[PDB]
Design a protein around this ligand. Structure first.
Ligand code: IMP
Ligand code: IMP
Ligand code: IMP
Ligand code: IMP
Ligand code: MG
Ligand code: MG
Ligand code: MG
Ligand code: MG
Lengths: 374, 375, 386, 375
């Protein structure tokens, strides 16, 4: 439950864990000792993550960084640096320090090597991770990566997009993907291990034998999802719809509100861009009102791209349902997404699964390629 | 004044003038007094900007903000903040503080309202401000705004691209711009008021009357440029190329070295593979540091082009300095518009000789021209 | 916040290196605003534009301490037991020192600490009923006895109008004569000006931190209070658990002398362990090792899963832990004389984390004072209320 | 040489080089690798200290730290770290990082270990480094150190005190030290190698075989002092006096102004009523900006004492250069010990012409002299 946590310091600072490694790397780079054997510094950092893995409530990493997440695996940050260093030679610089984005690459690679025991579940944030904002799947190169990985693991698609239990509009969003599944996975027995998650934990779809997605009976997973009052989801939405009107009235912008079942959010109409900071304001506006009305149901409000949405689902709950349904632990569960800020919908997955922060679908092909290289 | 500001604080920290205003606005944000009449705070900020225009090296603003730019005009920051807030209502925010890009637009509007004495020269960075990087000018709304300004004052195009003294290749880069000039900027005497600067300050061009750009000779304006012989420019070309060859080997990049007269470059090729943004910063400082090792004082410029590196023996500030010496216009009535206003960019040296407007994409240039015409 | 068992559990376990880096989160919140106000040059003009809006959040935090904008900005705000008039506190403090005429030197942390104390004093418009004093370093130098006629005159006049107590950390088991020798000049002034009034019955002394209690006699002598009168208010602690705390602490004071080789000794008491330095033929112990050791003590106590109320603190040149804290001492006094929290104040010098008087901010108004010279300025302004 | 400027960012961080080491030591303390073999980091910092000694203008230490000074000697920062660590074990700390003041002891120890080549001139700030502010000399343990050090090198006392060229006034400050010289430093000729400087570079005294000071002839050393005429000394004295008269009114000070030939200051009334340290730091920058506004270029110094402020015609750096030219001593063989090395102190300009030990009490000076004698 991260609804209450939305500290001002938790917003202005980018990421507490990644900046923790940058500032240490900055001091190392400044001392002109970055290119020498820095395993003495990296291993002490590597040991700290281990101590946090064992005692996440009283480790020294907790005393330094107060708002750390929970580590599910032993992170070989020493091996992650050498592997990333020898490739790009980022250490060869003498005037440019390491960048936040580079340490995020090193942090992502450290969570991949920690899967030396294996990996059972792998989920993707279909939007901005597989294809740009709203575009359809057309990259045939990474479709081969997902098909080969499905033969040895479960593959799920968890996206905040909602189409209200209509397993036909999701076809056009993935038609090129299932086309590759019919050519390779249909003969194999792995096609039954591919699942599609709509809404954020409200619509689930499987995969038949003809490379098409179909709905799942509600009785097969209604018990796994902690159920929620019919009327409470309406109150959450009614609160938001009132908050967005104030936002559109408080800031004269060219957008309108869109209403759905168990999800709403404003979308700019023909489109005229809305300032990124305003959508940040609207998330904290909606959250503080949900806390005021003492609502405890799982919800989410994210600032993805140039459109704001509020779902009565949770991307972490969708990860929790599949783990409880497929009998998969958290240490053998991964997720790939882009909205990993405090106002993003992929951040809750840090509480129940390993995470990989990605900025563009190209980095996912770099992620999946390094996965099966083991 | 050689570029000696290759400091670690210059790379790590952002613009000193903008972040100075952001921190004050954040304290006005957390104090919950942002929405109330903050003119008492905004008037004192102007009081510092006025005194800095008089004593730039002894002002209280220089004591607070070091390495601060030079204000050629008195900046009306109180008006600019009022009119910006009315446009976008940034102040009504309760949980998001004023950001960096907003203050960039506020200082741009402040530097636009400062032109009460009149504008006499506009300069435009070609790539990334008039059209995307590596594109030809394809816009009719922008060319219509420029046509009206061309009758009021002189307009010039100062770019970093370089085709060796070929006016046919320059008109190809902005075809639809001369097309609009041929329809509305011929009957008036403004067609003799348009200029184009190739390289960075090495090739000068002008517009002939029959809808096509032509190249001006060298002997007419070479005396205004600083005298740098052909041997020194080639050593700058050589010590650079030796530094790039280190960068290709050091980081193993699929990058090519483009060599031309008075310019060295670093361009990749598709099998375009993207060089890492940070090795460009590292390679620029390597070339700048290597040049001053040999005690060179020739006006050069090494910059990062977002996706590539280029080192020109011309200075984008020299081009503005050349046109100021040709048209007999003081630095108070000269303005520049560019996207490379970081320490690694090439539009930054224009802070030393002209008013500067910071822009990130062509859509903001059109918004800057509309506001600059309602005067 | 919640009951005192919840706040003490977080105070001795939820510390952070970032939080311990900044002395106070609330005072630093005002320094950044005044810094930008000083940097914006607009500080010397009429800044009621900005100050009034700071009060607005201070009032909103008094009515809603858990979901206020002040709790959004500062994550670890305490709980305001009253409405702080920071606008009048700024005007009154500035009209005296005129710190706003400075052009090249911003306001400092210690100055905003003074203004915040004056704001907490002006907030006692509803009256005051209890006033407690950290004895050492606020009533007299560290380790000294009471010796200030100006301070005795202020406490005596306040004693006739309200109850007076002294919460210290010095732990003499039950020898009131040893406490009397520390304040003999204070009871001497009380004998000449307070026996005529019935105010000497309103004077109390708290030995250790909430472990021993004494009251003043009609003969100006200090006497022990019967334990059957107040032992029930204190949260009881098992004799096995207290010796568990003293032993687990005593072990680290040997490890800190082995790591750092200090010429220091370890004093062990019932419900008290100490780390004192040796004489010169007094040796000086570094301040950071003392801060380091307190974190070591606190870190080790939670590792052994002890949840009893304790207080590891830094005494400038000393390091002690006591089974009990000053917040428990205030609770017992508040339960004894039936006094609401809003009409109780406490003056001390150790208001940092790993400090002595820090738990007081959870159940009373607090004044952060550096030396007895500053203590007079607090009581002199307190007498100016009526 | 000229006295440089300052920024508000530079006034906050007392010493950039010390602060440059704390942030590195913090991340070492933060990485959990502080107590391990960190020699690889210590040797690399030395590599920058060495490369800055050989090439002070273009070094990576100059690129990282802008306001870095001139290293007259190679600084062995690695051995100074182990030596200070083995004494206090500040590295075994698990929850408190190394502090600013501990690195000061390390930088002082690193500058002491750099004197393996030898010393030729030792200089002491009399006030606050030899005795408390305004007290006569009274220590035999420190007198034995100065006496034993007067044998091997020249020792001078450079203090901002100013008694009008009469040795008796200065002697009352150094009475117990001179009586120790008669017992130990008269049988040889070591008393002839002792010097005392009244003011920053105005008054000079030598020791006599009777353990007594005498004013040296002005003709024997005044040619090294950069001449400053009566009109220029009085303009600094007046421009200062006007600043203090406003500082008294602005803050309602209970203080007075004292005027001397070549000197002026602000002292509190006798009662010794405390005067705020902040308004003292404010009066420095008030006068310093006012002096540069009137284009004054004479050597001057406005410093902030413990309980008072003073402005003197001359700086301790020029006083050192007088003695360096007097006894023909090279720069790399000079050393100085002072208490106020902040940007508003009389001992800061020493960094431009000598090595420096930064202390804060006479007990730390003994720790410096004991470590110096044990080489
Ligand atoms: O309720 C929904 N209905 C339709 N689209 C949505 C809904 N919620 C989010 N979206 C959009 O669909 C995408 C889902 O975000 P994701 O978590 O990155 O996949 C984003 O582009 C959202 O703006
Ligand atoms: O000398 C040149 N020859 C060819 N291309 C260049 C040359 N110099 C710069 N460029 C490229 O053209 C762009 C023009 O930059 P701009 O016009 O300053 O925005 C640069 O960013 C480079 O990509
Ligand atoms: O339990 C104890 N018994 C005796 N002396 C103590 C004890 N605890 C702390 N001290 C010392 O007595 C001082 C009194 O602390 P204070 O009165 O809380 O300021 C401390 O700063 C320590 O030097
Ligand atoms: O010119 C002066 N005449 C008399 N006393 C002075 C003069 N200048 C400074 N002082 C005092 O002597 C002290 C010398 O400090 P020092 O610079 O550390 O030697 C100052 O802090 C003042 O108290
Ligand atoms: Mg996404
Ligand atoms: Mg550009
Ligand atoms: Mg105390
Ligand atoms: Mg001194």
């Amino acid at each position: 439950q991260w609804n209450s946590r939305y500290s001002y310091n938790q917003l202005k600072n980018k990421d507490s864990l990644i900046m923790f490694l940058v500032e240490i790397f900055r001091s190392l780079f400044v001392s002109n000792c970055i290119d020498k054997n820095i395993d003495n510094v990296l291993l002490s950092i590597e040991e700290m993550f281990i101590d946090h893995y064992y005692n996440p409530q009283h480790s020294r990493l907790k005393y330094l960084i107060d708002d750390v997440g929970i580590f599910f695996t032993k992170l070989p940050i020493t091996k992650a640096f050498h592997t990333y260093n020898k490739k790009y030679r980022i250490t060869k610089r003498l005037y440019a320090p390491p960048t936040f984005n580079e340490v995020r690459h090193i942090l992502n690679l450290a969570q991949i090597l920690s899967l030396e025991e294996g990996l059972d579940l792998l989920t993707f944030d279909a939007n901005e991770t597989l294809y740009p904002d709203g575009h359809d799947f057309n990259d045939e190169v990474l479709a081969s990566y997902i098909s080969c990985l499905l033969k040895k693991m479960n593959i799920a698609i968890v996206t905040a997009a909602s189409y209200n239990n209509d397993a036909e509009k999701y076809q056009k969003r993935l038609e090129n993907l299932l086309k590759y599944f019919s050519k390779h996975n249909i003969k194999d027995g792995s096609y039954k291990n591919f699942y599609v998650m709509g809404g954020e934990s409200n619509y689930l779809f499987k995969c038949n034998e003809e490379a098409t997605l179909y709905s799942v009976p509600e009785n097969e997973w209604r018990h796994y999802k902690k159920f929620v009052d019919y009327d409470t989801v309406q109150e959450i939405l009614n609160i938001s719809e009132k908050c967005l009107e104030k936002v559109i009235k408080d800031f004269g912008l060219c957008a309108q509100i869109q209403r759905k079942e168990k999800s709403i959010g404003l979308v700019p109409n023909k489109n005229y861009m809305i300032k990124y900071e305003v959508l940040e304001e609207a998330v904290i506006r909606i959250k503080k009102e949900i806390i005021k009305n003492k609502i405890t149901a799982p919800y989410c409000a994210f600032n993805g791209g140039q459109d704001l949405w509020v779902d009565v689902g949770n991307k972490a709950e969708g990860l929790l349902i599949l783990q409880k349904l497929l009998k998969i632990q958290k240490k053998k569960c991964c997720h790939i997404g882009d909205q990993f800020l405090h106002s993003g919908n992929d951040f809750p997955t840090r509480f129940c699964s390993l995470t990989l922060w990605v900025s563009n679908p190209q980095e996912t092909k770099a992620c999946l390629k390094s996965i099966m290289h083991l």
